Amino acid sequence: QEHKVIIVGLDNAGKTTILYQFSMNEVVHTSPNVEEIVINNTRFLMWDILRSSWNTYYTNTEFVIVVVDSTDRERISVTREELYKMLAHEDLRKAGLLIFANKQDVKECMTVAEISQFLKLTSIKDHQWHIQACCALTGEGLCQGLEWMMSRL
Amino acid sequence: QEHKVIIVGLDNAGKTTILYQFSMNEVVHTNVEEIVINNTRFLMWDIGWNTYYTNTEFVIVVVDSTDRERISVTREELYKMLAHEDLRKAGLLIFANKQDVKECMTVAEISQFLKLTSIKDHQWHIQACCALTGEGLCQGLEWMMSRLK
Amino acid sequence: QEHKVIIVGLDNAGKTTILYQFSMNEVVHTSNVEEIVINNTRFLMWDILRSSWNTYYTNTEFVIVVVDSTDRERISVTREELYKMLAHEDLRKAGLLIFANKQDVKECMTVAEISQFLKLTSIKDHQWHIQACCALTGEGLCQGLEWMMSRL
Amino acid sequence: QEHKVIIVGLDNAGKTTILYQFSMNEVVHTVEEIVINNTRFLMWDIGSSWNTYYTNTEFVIVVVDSTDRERISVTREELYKMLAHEDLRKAGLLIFANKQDVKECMTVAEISQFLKLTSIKDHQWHIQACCALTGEGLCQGLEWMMSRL
Ligand SMILES: Nc1nc2c(ncn2[C@@H]2O[C@H](COP(=O)(O)OP(=O)(O)O)[C@@H](O)[C@H]2O)c(=O)[nH]1
Ligand SMILES: Nc1nc2c(ncn2[C@@H]2O[C@H](COP(=O)(O)OP(=O)(O)O)[C@@H](O)[C@H]2O)c(=O)[nH]1
Ligand SMILES: Nc1nc2c(ncn2[C@@H]2O[C@H](COP(=O)(O)OP(=O)(O)O)[C@@H](O)[C@H]2O)c(=O)[nH]1
Ligand SMILES: Nc1nc2c(ncn2[C@@H]2O[C@H](COP(=O)(O)OP(=O)(O)O)[C@@H](O)[C@H]2O)c(=O)[nH]1
Secondary structure (H helix, E strand, O other): OEEEEEEEOOOOOOHHHHHHHHOOOOOEOOOOOEEEEEEOOEEEEEEEOOOOOOOOOOOOOOEEEEEEEOOOOOOHHHHHHHHHHHHOOHHHOOOEEEEEEEOOOOOOOOOHHHHHHHOOHHHOOOOOEEEEEOEOOOOEOHHHHHHHHHHOO | OEEEEEEEOOOOOOHHHHHHHHOOOOOEOOOEEEEEEOOEEEEEEEOOOOOOOOOOOEEEEEEEOOOOOOHHHHHHHHHHHHOOHHHOOOEEEEEEEOOOOOOOOOHHHHHHHHOHHHOOOOOEEEEEOEOOOOEOHHHHHHHHHHOOO | OEEEEEEEOOOOOOHHHHHHHHOOOOOOOOOOEEEEEEOOEEEEEEEOOOOOOOOOOOOOOEEEEEEEOOOOOOHHHHHHHHHHHHOOHHHOOOEEEEEEEOOOOOOOOOHHHHHHHHOHHHOOOOOEEEEEOEOOOOEOHHHHHHHHHHOO | OEEEEEEEOOOOOOHHHHHHHHOOOOOEOOOEEEEEOOEEEEEEEOOOOOOOOOOOEEEEEEEEEOOOOOOHHHHHHHHHHHHHOHHHOOOEEEEEEEOOOOOOOOOHHHHHHHOOHHHOOOOOEEEEEOEOOOOEOHHHHHHHHHHOO
16 A cells, blocks of 8 residues: 655745655665655655646645745745645545644754744644644754654554 | 543643644654554644543643743643643653744743652653744654553 | 672762653663663662671773863862872773763853863873763763673 | 664864764663674774775765864765765665754854755765763664665
């Protein structure tokens, strides 16, 4: 079984770097923007996100990973708008939500608690969710996010 | 077999948020909530002729680490509660909540003020946490697991 | 089989509080001379005139040295006692665990500063580990106990 | 089966101290052989005629002095020169950002960015903050190596 995971977030958030770092992660099996990521016996198929009749992103999707640039205080309102537009889709009713508060290495960034509060994460009533501080330049924090998704299978 | 836990603290401490976050925690299987960890079932009561204290195995005390004015109030209630006959064998887990807030009391400051290292008749653990993110909550739950009979 | 551990350090370092907190630690089974059980392993821990003998080093498997991180005035005394102790042939096979205690207090010596002052990386004939800790919360104590377990 | 490992870096980086501390590490059983669980590593702290990277080098550990802003460019050049060697094509790369205890040192993220680590295409790599005076961070570096066998 392949478990479908999509990676969303605004440009420059760290989506490419995060998916790349997943392959280097200690809990992820070694392997030589659509990557199969294997943890123990579990296979995830991860997608880093006109003539098509269909938007295919949300279909059969088990986890959405939202990447947030923690340094960007102005665009966070845009991330929030997109988060809630996305959560309004019936396709995602069963999906777990993992939020990466990325670029936590940068001084004066928003704290993970400030991000949780602004995004009103504790008001979410119909989805499992987890917010995780991370730095995609080092992979710090990514293992914890992946292990949370594993616990939600 | 259900293991009874009561969650107590002053208003605005974080009780509702902590119990909600338990449901989202990595160690937990997906006012009164069943929380399952591995094969262990906890029945957790958020407090706020009957007594909620009956058959309690764990007391979780939530402390707002920013509330310097009312930590004296929490201390008095803590020790008043520890003297109840229903609670004499109970494990005590103290969450020093709102640790994300700048200039809050530190967990060591809270331990020292509450005189926790002077407790003689109860297993206890104090744990820094932030209920907005669930950080610290896993460690608190894991400590309770290790105190199961 | 009891594994003998001694807890040493200057007055006010935190020896009493640490031994107390061992009883509350997640890795320790719920239960100044105390039996501490971790999984199946039993440690007999002693927190240290008319006696003919120094009995503290006899058959001692681990020495826990508790250092007050805030105490810059007496760190040289800790160092002297550490090396006098380590010169004892009785302790030739003992593992050394150093708790850099009171890490919660602002402007305390860092664990690296303590290690450098104590010249710990110059130790040639003993297994050793230094661990930051706060005895008021038990933070750091688990890591210290796990290191001893790994040295059995 | 011995898994061969070389430890490299400029003078004063912390190579001697790190290899020393591996033998004191919790995950390690009590030029050196380091055993983790059932796995034997043979580790050479590099620093001659007819000498080169010993055959079947499985891991390269690069030690970076985090305080050394002047010479991090020197280290970057040596790193990529090493990564160009055909006989190191299958090698895992573990970078220890050492001396993280020293105030105002480069952060691990600054080091990763300067070394352009996330642009590496042909190797498994991990960067790990550490302090060789205490051993902090060494365990995680060793564990990453174990996961790459
Ligand atoms: N300082 C810092 N930079 C990062 C981090 N994650 C990614 N970046 C950088 O931010 C830029 C955008 O990253 P990228 O992964 O391409 O973002 P994407 O547009 O969401 O796919 C690149 O220069 C990355 O190196 C981080 O955690 N900290
Ligand atoms: N900044 C911060 N706010 C928190 C934390 N935990 C809870 N809160 C907020 O504090 C307020 C009271 O929390 P709540 O769970 O309702 O407290 P209760 O009265 O004890 O049940 C709410 O607005 C929460 O979102 C925390 O760790 N940090
Ligand atoms: N702030 C702080 N105080 C501590 C810590 N550990 C112990 N203490 C306090 O230090 C004092 C001496 O501790 P004690 O355990 O009696 O030291 P002993 O003389 O070595 O046995 C007591 O007031 C303890 O509560 C700590 O980690 N931080
Ligand atoms: N402050 C600090 N000093 C360190 C650290 N690691 C090593 N050193 C010291 O730096 C010096 C050089 O270390 P060494 O292991 O001999 O480096 P080598 O030349 O690469 O083998 C010695 O004095 C060590 O004690 C560290 O993490 N922090």
